[model samples]
Every structure is written in structure tokens, then in C-alpha cells.
Target: TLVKDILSKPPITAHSNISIMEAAKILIKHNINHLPIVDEHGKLVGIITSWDIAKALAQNKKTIEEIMTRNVITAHEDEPVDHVAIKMSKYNISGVPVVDDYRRVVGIVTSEDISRLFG
Candidate 1:
């Protein structure tokens, strides 16, 4: 299966500049474990997981950029789902941002998404 086939489209994303408070709310509102961080023009730049949010809140981190993981590993829409799974396992990550050819994040895929299909 391809990533686009099972990924969550129109992902709940956060701007790089948003406050940690805002990012926490979005994650709670969407019941998501990860938030893809985007640039002004919708380019995927980083990612913040629930763990990141928790740590930021504990330390009172101000911005998403302060807590987000830069140099994020991403999955392309057409990539095999297994490839994404492997990366996730290798990195001990629960989710990944899904991007297009131009690297604009269009979706997200979590370990839960993978489990539903093949677990």
C-alpha cells in the first residue's frame, strides 16, 4: 500500500511560529499524536510530537520552533507504506509527515494508521 492510500489527509498542522499553547490545543482537538510543522508557503519544515509538547509545557517552551524536531524524516505520497513503517521503527517515531513532490505537507501517518492496515 502507498502512504497516500492510508494517510490522514489535510493533516492538522502547526505553523513554525505558533505558540506551544496553540500547538497543544490543536493536538488535543484533533486527537493526534504528532503535529507537522510548516513554513509560510506550506513547506514541511519540522515536526512536534505529543512527547515534545509535554516536555515543552513542563519547561514552558514558547514557540513550536523551540520544541519541534528539525531535520524531520518524511514520507512521499507514493512511497510504499512499509518503507515509512521501517523508517518509523528505525527512528522510534510514532508518526511522519506526508509530503508532495515539492515537499508541501499534505497528510500525516501514525503508527496507528499502520496498525489498522497490517497489524
Candidate 2:
């Protein structure tokens, strides 16, 4: 199936300059574990996960950008889900941004998101 088919659900996003406090509120309020950081044009820049937030706190960082993974490995919406799954496993990643050919992120995928398929 296409990635869009799975990403049809609501997406969570964050601005690159958004403070850690604000981003934390969104994550807590929405009960989301991932936040896709975007530029002014809404292009994907990086992703901040719950783990990232935790690490930031552990190190005493005051902003989400300080802990976010800057070099993200994004997947295309047209790519096979299995391929993405393999990449996730190979890289030991829990989540990945779904991007377009232009590098604009349109969605996100998480381990929990994939688990719904197993059951």
C-alpha cells in the first residue's frame, strides 16, 4: 500500500525555531511521540521524537532544536512500506518523515503506527 494511505490520519508538525517548551506541550497535549520540524515554507528540516525530548532534558537543553536529529533519513510516500520498515530496522530508528520528491514532508511514520498493521 502507498504511504499516503497510512498517513491519512492527522499529522503533527513543529517549526524549526519552536521552543522546546511549546513543542513539549504539543506532544503532551496530543499524546504524540513525534514532531516533524519544518521551515517557514513547511519543508521538512528535522524530526524531534519523545526520546529526543527526554535526551534534551537529561542534558538540560532549553530548545527542541538542540536535541532533534538534524540529519534525517526520510522516505517517499511512493516507496514501499516494507522498504521503509527495513530501513527503520537497519538504522534502529523508531520513526521517519514521509517526504515528497521536492523534500517537503507530508507525513510521518512511527513504530506504533506500523504496529497497527500487525494486529
- Best-fitting candidate, scored by TM-score: 1
- Residue 117 local lDDT, model 2: 66
RMSD of each: 1.4, 1.6
The list of candidate 2 runs beyond 4 A from truth reads: none
Lowest summed lDDT across 10 adjacent residues in model 1 is found at 5-14
Q: Give the candidate number with the greatest lDDT.
A: 1
Error of 1 at 21 (Å): 0.9
Give the whole-model CA lDDT for all candidates, comma-separated.
0.87, 0.82
Candidate 1 wrong stretches, greater than 4 Å: none
Candidate 2 residue lDDT tens string, 1-119: 66777886756788867777888898999888778888888788788877887888899988777778889987898988788888889999888899888878888888777778655
lDDT of 1 at 83: 96
Measured with C-alpha atoms, the lDDT of residue 36 in candidate 2 is 86
TM-score of 1: 0.91
